[PDB]
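Margin note from the TA: students keep mixing up input and output lines. Inputs are the sequences; the output is the structure of the whole complex. Example:
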Amino acid sequence: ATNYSANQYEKAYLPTYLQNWSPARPTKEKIAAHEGYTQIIANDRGHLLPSVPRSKASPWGSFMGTWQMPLKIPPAKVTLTARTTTAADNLTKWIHKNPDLLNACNGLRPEISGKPFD
Amino acid sequence: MRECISIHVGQAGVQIGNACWELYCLEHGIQPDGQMPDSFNTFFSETGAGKHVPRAVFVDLEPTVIDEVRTGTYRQLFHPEQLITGKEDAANNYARGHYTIGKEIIDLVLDRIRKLADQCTGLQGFLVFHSFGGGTGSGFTSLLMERLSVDYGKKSKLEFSIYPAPQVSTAVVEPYNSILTTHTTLEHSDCAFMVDNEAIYDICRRNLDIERPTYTNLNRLIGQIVSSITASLRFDGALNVDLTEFQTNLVPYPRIHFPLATYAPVISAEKAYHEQLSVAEITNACFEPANQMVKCDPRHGKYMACCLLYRGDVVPKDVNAAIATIKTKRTIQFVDWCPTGFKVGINYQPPTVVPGGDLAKVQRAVCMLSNTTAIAEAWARLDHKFDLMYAKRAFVHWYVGEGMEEGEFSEAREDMAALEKDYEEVGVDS
Amino acid sequence: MRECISIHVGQAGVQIGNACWELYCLEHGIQPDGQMPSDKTIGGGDDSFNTFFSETGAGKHVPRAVFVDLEPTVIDEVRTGTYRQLFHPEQLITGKEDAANNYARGHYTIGKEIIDLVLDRIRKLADQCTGLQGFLVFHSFGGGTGSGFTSLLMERLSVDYGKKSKLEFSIYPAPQVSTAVVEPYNSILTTHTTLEHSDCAFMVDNEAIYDICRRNLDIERPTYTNLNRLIGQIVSSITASLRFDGALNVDLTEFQTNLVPYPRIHFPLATYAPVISAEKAYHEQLSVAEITNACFEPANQMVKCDPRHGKYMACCLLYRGDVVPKDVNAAIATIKTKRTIQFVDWCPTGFKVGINYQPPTVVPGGDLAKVQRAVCMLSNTTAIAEAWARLDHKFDLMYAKRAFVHWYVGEGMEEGEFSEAREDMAALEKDYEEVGVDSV
Amino acid sequence: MREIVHLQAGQCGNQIGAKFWEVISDEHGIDPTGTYHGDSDLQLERINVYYNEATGGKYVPRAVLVDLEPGTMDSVRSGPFGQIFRPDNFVFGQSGAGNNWAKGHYTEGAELVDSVLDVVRKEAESCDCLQGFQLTHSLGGGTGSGMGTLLISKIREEYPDRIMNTFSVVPSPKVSDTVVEPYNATLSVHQLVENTDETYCIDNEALYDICFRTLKLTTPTYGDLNHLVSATMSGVTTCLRFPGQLNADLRKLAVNMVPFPRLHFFMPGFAPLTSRGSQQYRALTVPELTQQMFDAKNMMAACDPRHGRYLTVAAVFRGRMSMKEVDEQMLNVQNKNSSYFVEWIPNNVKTAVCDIPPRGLKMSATFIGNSTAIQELFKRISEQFTAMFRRKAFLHWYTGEGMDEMEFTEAESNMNDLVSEYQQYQDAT
Amino acid sequence: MREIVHLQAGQCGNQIGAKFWEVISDEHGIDPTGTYHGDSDLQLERINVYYNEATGGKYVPRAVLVDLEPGTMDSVRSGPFGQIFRPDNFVFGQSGAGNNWAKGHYTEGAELVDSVLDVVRKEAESCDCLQGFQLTHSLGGGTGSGMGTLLISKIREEYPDRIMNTFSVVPSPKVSDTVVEPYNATLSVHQLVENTDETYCIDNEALYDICFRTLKLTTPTYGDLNHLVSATMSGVTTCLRFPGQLNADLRKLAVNMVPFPRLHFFMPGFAPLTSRGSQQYRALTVPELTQQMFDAKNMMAACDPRHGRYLTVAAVFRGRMSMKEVDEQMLNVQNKNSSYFVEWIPNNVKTAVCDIPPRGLKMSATFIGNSTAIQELFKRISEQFTAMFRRKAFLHWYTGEGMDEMEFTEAESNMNDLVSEYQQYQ
Amino acid sequence: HGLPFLPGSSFTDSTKTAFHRSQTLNYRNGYAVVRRPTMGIGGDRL
Amino acid sequence: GKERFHKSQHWGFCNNVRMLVSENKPGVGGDLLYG
């Protein structure tokens, strides 16, 4: 699915405005146009065609469980200002060495804003 | 007009049809002797003697289940030929229930359906209740759905089934049956909502506080899902949904017709006191994997279609707002090729409490029928256990020696080995 | 709006939660069975309770709390007590076997077993709030589930909830008395792993609250019931600008931006001034400037370290009762003129004031007096740099011979996490040093 | 003398039709049994635009109710005004549509279109000088979309000079009440664009938003959203029914509205809608109707006109007012806002003034806008349609009744070319 | 005809802006319900400057009450005059600022600026000839200072030649009611330099030094300190609303005050306030309104003009007094005490006489003065910024919203320029 | 009755114990709902 | 009705024509104006 935008009335459907205080699914602000006849990318009974370039990702969606979640989870916010360069480097390496946490469906969407003191 | 003919096959079909029909008598005014002390026509048909007789056919191959109906409370309600019994059962065998024993009784059930199809003016379609594990629920039922198609045509053939559970099971020889009936009904059935007994055991233990439940606590919950599917043919509504509306919105492909079932506000009467039960609270709990009715987790697959059946004191904007919160969450993820997703239906008659029941008296309700790719484990686990015994030819002499060629084990395992690839490629991107 | 989700963890957290929620029921109109005495107005009369209490359809108010433990014997007198009908039963989570003063049992083995059950319950209470200010955490460093699982509560809160404000009250271990023997291994390892994950962290210790009940109140032999009553009168005064009418309002967001200047330094210390006895309020006039001076007094402090050893990094004054906004000014200007208080060089502004109209509440059979004005305070001081030095002292003591380390290594946890979480704290001891230097 | 025949299809069309006929009966003083009980004499003069006269002073409406099963017309009969509809004007079948456009168009709806055409030809050959037909229907179901467009095609092959006017409940952007909507929406838009003279677009998210932020109903129902639709439905045909100082019928609105034949989809709005208890904060004058007709959060269409350019605008006023104020404001908004108005049309607004305000009000006004910012509807439907259609998502249900495979192709090419036509007239100099 | 659209921001703005509508309503004869119950015809002749007309002969103010969390406007609604406001005018968010400027300026305020500029645009275009706006706000806070500068920034780009006033409450020299004051107040004077037409400075100790020393109030609440702010919000705007032997609107005091456009920070006052038992001792003449406008202890700004030079002076009078006697004292104070007046303007004082006194009073008098003794308000905030800033004190609460470090550098340096721009004339 | 609303002409009631605000501003299903105040601060009958 | 909401079948076929086959039937449980 894709969320969309009730153009006038997006403010009642803002996710914090429907009492959902966590990370949420983003919406499509601008709808792109196209014309003509759309090619049937998939043959009958739902098979994708052979020469259609399939995505590299998994077929089943990436939900990270509890016994699958990495030990020593990095923080959600990490602003690097008022830090030493080596400590900020260790924080960014901590964020870097866990690509499976940051890519999941229920994954950590972190914050790296700012520059540490040299 | 707008009638429905229920067909109940097997002990798991008869004993569900004792708790479905106890509700329908009581939801209308009907006493258990047939007398009312005009919305009943979808399930009842008035005789000139004042006596309402249901549109149903009970089938079994063993007399010890229907002879409880002929002696119990509802012995005057049922027509004496609407309850059919054999003399020998099928004994957890596909071959006996399909060829040798089921053939002597298939030509008499189609006599009874032909009479019950000659009284309905506008007949919506049939309903089947059976169990995959049994001998007559799996062998005879796959002989009804082959002969229903050529005799009636494009009539809707919905079905409810007790799919096998991931750990618990009655019988040993249940994976031979659960494959040999999925292969031979896969082209002859329209839609197959599935519950399994283990996930309803984990709801009556957890949602209601009924430790050690019994089948009569399970046959009553299924009767509250069948009641909310045909709830818009009887009671006045704001968005009606027929029995024709379900195949067109949940079956994207003719080999993929296995949805799941969820009924949201199942609570006890000591917890309806504590919580408000608004439209958003019951919508959010259909999509919750703790409240599903099969032990398969929709988070580990992609949704394909949904169908929400609201019922009670509901309002159109609280339906529209609560869906748009589901469409925003990152955990409800849809397939590449389904951008709309939903079907809604709003009724007015609030659910009816049964004396002796378990659920509370409630004011709103949701029944959701969702089609998911997450069922791919349910066939792949069952495919292990067919393959595990059949690799060294176990229990096969109980199937070859009664009217069945041996090659139906290799083709019914070849054929469903395409169904596992069939689920896999329809969720794959472009 | 203005909702707050309380999370109580440990036997300390439960027994503090029983103290606070009796105060909140009396402070609004709620009976012990949930109901109000009937509202006798048209429609809903007063909706002030919505920060802490929800409401069903029928007129029953259920708190926004989660009570957590790993031993069954502590919640089973919440479940069969006077307030057994107030709490929705699923908010009270118990284990079957406890963590047994091990951080490692409470973090890796038993805490991970029970983490995903209670992070489903805090979703449900956080999807009932139209505007959520931030959580509250009530724990003690000493125990297993008060240190181990509580530190892992904060870590999985940061992943799921982002930069949402997660306050915490805590019982820091006492300097002289102590319940247990293994408390320095617990207290070091949890201040290391909550350090980048927690927003603010107020501390008291039980030995200092012993010094007030015996001395200021005339109650010899205070049980933990008399200590937990005073903790509820600090949490109430932090959150009474959210429920009752104020002249200056303060949220739960204005404490982190006004006492936490630097990322590793989020340790303010609580104080509550007119805690007095009913034989000795017959004699004393309690003005607005008479109770301001008694938050800066080293006797009436609520931790066993003297602020005079260090420098006041900031303050936060919470005035509650029948006060004047001009006599709040008329006392702060006096305090700055003394040379026995010393603000840090780079903080020339100092303060943060809050004025609220509802006077503090009298609990029937409680300790204090019916007082008409009161002051609460959360101040951040350099004088806490003497508190880790008495915890580096008792970690390196038993660690140089490696006592009790086998009770954490075989309990699902490697051994190099010991010799880095005391090296991690070793920077914090010099980090409190350089903010103690003046900018020459 | 200028009769208007009504056609209701589907359950959406039946409920909207029941509420609309309740509105007209209130307006002309027809009680729930059929006898006139009115006050003025203007209520009875041009009653023949909607009401046929029977013996004994009973007024039976000129409406035809169509469905594929009678499960909705049981509910229509059991209402308050169910006894005024003639029993023979109800057409029903035995089996439902099942949210299937193919079963609505080819299989089931073909055996019913003959009976419906017989009924509407009998009502049309009783009008002295008929003006045209209204259809109220939904583009998501099977009876409303499929059979409704079958009726529109077979009406406009036989009465090809009269007015065809549709009120269509097009799909909503956030929540879709059917998984298989955009197939039916595409295959109905492709028929509407050839065979209708006017089509108004109605969205339920827009109706919910008006009943929450402006009327401030705590629990709105469909029995209120239908009141909004009916109140703007019976405001475009007032000047056929009541006197005025500047009359305008539906032909005149079409003539001044549509500049090119493929461009006839409109966005409605209704002016004096005001809150429950905020009546004492708001005056009721002509500028207070203008600033609320033209407010972009007042459209019933869920498309923002600030993305595009108003090709034409119409305003239909009710009440006793001043021509200087009316023409002053319809010039004033054009001069103050001149990036949302095209320049190759120098004046864009057509104004009509009728005399009799609705029963309860002092003034009223209705707005019908024709914009090149309605193409977002078709671009969104085109993108969801190609997303499902490239993978044969639900395609077996449609294919199994004799539908071709080229029909989806030609429908999506037609809608995409209509989108490009809108964008050409937006970007024209 | 000369309409003024009022704005008020935050928990200081909604406490100043609630008493101000309780001093104007009784000035014009308006009940708690809203109806007119007056005893003249001047009380209704020019009421459209502040009051919109409603239905049924009822009047509604043009207040746009703005806040970032609605707790401090539930108290405003429950007062004795809470029903006079149109409820659509209330603007409010869910979670506040925490006395943080950036959260109010960049992060949380910016999600609430487009809902405010629907309300003002619905009222600024419902005026026959709009004269200008106002704003009552405090520089110490988070939503007064924070988004209240975003409001002036995003309406000077839509109505760029009208009037924009602000009644600031700039911080205090002894006791500071927020630790993080010098970051907010330095970063907000820097916005007000290039974005306001006028701005009045108010310190809250100078309001304390009246009600103790002069009014003799033993317990002065902020009710009796908001009542002094609202008794000079009406003196500046009286000659609009009430007839005169000599008139002065808002523009004419602006023309005759600012010699250069960077120099628009003034210091108010209000004369005829008197103590409790000393009302029967008072002489009632005209030169005893010139004593207490100009008395160097009763400014509302906590900046003594003895350190500085009066660049210009205003004076607004309320009563039926004599034009010889009003002009005589302006010749008197300029020619006794002429070390406090600049030399390249030979008559610094602008005068104005309204005719309709406040109710119960026989005369009244109001003052506005532009000084070089007001640059010392801007020196003191600089060293408490740049002491706090050279050791990077609270900056992670601010830079963690994405700010730059050199943005703090100019708001220091722009305020350092206006310190030395004022300091030429002394 | 009959006193002007000047500073000093206003009496404070010292007997008032209730200071709660009536919720006149609420959200229902994502929309802001304004209720007219029937009751003042503390439950005082407006 | 207001507790029961039964829909009585008013229209239908008899002798293979469309008819109003009821002609004496209730509404949603209560009578019509034919009582």
